Design a protein around this nucleic acid. Sequence first.
RNA 1: AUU
Lengths: 299, 114
Amino acid sequence: NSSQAWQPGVAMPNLYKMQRMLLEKCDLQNYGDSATLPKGIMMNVAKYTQLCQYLNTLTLAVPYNMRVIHFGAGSDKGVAPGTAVLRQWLPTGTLLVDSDLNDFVSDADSTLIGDCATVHTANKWDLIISDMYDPKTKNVTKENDSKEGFFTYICGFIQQKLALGGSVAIKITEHSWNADLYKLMGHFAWWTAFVTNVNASSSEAFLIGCNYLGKPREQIDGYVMHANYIFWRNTNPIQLSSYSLFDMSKFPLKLRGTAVMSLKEGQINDMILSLLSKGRLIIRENNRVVISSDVLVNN
Amino acid sequence: FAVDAAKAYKDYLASGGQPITNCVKMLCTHTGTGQAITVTPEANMDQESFGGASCCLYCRCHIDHPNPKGFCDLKGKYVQIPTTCANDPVGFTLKNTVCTVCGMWKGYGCSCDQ
RNA sequence: AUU
Ligand SMILES: Nc1ncnc2c1ncn2[C@@H]1O[C@H](CSCC[C@H](N)C(=O)O)[C@@H](O)[C@H]1O
Ligand SMILES: OC[C@@]1(O)OC[C@@H](O)[C@@H](O)[C@@H]1O
Ligand SMILES: OC[C@H]1O[C@H](O)[C@H](O)[C@@H](O)[C@@H]1O
Ligand SMILES: OC[C@H]1O[C@H](O)[C@H](O)[C@@H](O)[C@@H]1O
Ligand SMILES: [Cl-]
Ligand SMILES: [Mg+2]
Ligand SMILES: [Mg+2]
Ligand SMILES: [Zn+2]
Ligand SMILES: [Zn+2]
């Protein structure tokens, strides 16, 4: 019955981002509650649908021949529900690559199996989606500190392989988070922590960076920002809702035909930064897309 | 010698076997063209749309596709399954044929005969 | 986190 129940989810309000909270234990009023989904619909089809519905409200750059990479695309079901939703959402012809530590069946153009740290790409990407989560995160035996592992790889991959004007959606939870990733959110024209309405009973959120600038527009302390995120979640219970899943008439990402140009670092003036910040420009080469996974050889 | 997965699955279903689970059902308007295999969900009011790879016996069993180049006609696309048969999408795509003229399933949409 |  809450107004936010008809939305795909809830974004962290600006005043919560401006606080200096100390990290506390996350204690959601509805922790673990299950959502009633449309008949036969998987949780991750519902969750990725709500993420895409929210991304539709932002200034995403959508060039012709868009390039999208999806990390953590596998599942205990052996299929890739999130990849299927991204394939539905993205313009026909969009190149979609997905990856996971474990083998799985995918609708992506190409799938790389192995630790994400083994994944190398010669090309830059327009959109990076990560749903990676380390199962060992469930073994909480000490203070909740910034996590490394795949987050270290994701921070480096964003800084080296995301096109200027590009965007990211990186999944975090109370214990699955990284301070450097929050700091990098300050290198985008805008950012938020987005909670889907179908999984509002979880500390899960997608850290969304919209329109990459390749330089810090604001200085973010990641430890403080995660504490701010948990404070927001602890004081703002969100009602589980699948209301947005029933109207798919405006679901597909609009093909904007965003300009793609190759500019050297030094030609990025305030006029170029303004176009990047408005989702009207992608800066990267347009060479053939080549990917690989490093294989360790042993007896 | 070559393994006949298609025949093995059909024989399994005839013996009372549980259909392959975890076919990925998509959210859609149900106001689509109703064609069998499409670039995006095209379910009409009498169908469900599924991610193609999750409904392919060869993709799901991790076995070679039955054709020289081993090409998959479902991976990366969406398959429309009649709502009355949506409990076994893998079996439906395996036992049915697409009309090369209208793109509808023969016996479940194709009206070229009339 | 894969309800
Ligand atoms: N270092 C790493 N490299 C690659 N994948 C990783 C990883 N750490 C965790 N993952 C993957 O993260 C995934 C979390 S479950 C992901 C669910 C999936 N997005 C869906 O649509 O249903 C797991 O498959 C796990 O193998
Ligand atoms: O594969 C068919 C199906 O109905 O089997 C049971 C569940 O796994 C559903 O998600 C799936 O679509
Ligand atoms: O790739 C999927 C697999 O890895 C994940 O980390 C999960 O912990 C496991 O349940 C799943 O089977
Ligand atoms: O089951 C709890 C809730 O979950 C679902 O997401 C529905 O939107 C809502 O009608 C229901 O009350
Ligand atoms: Cl925006
Ligand atoms: Mg499960
Ligand atoms: Mg949940
Ligand atoms: Zn296949
Ligand atoms: Zn026909």
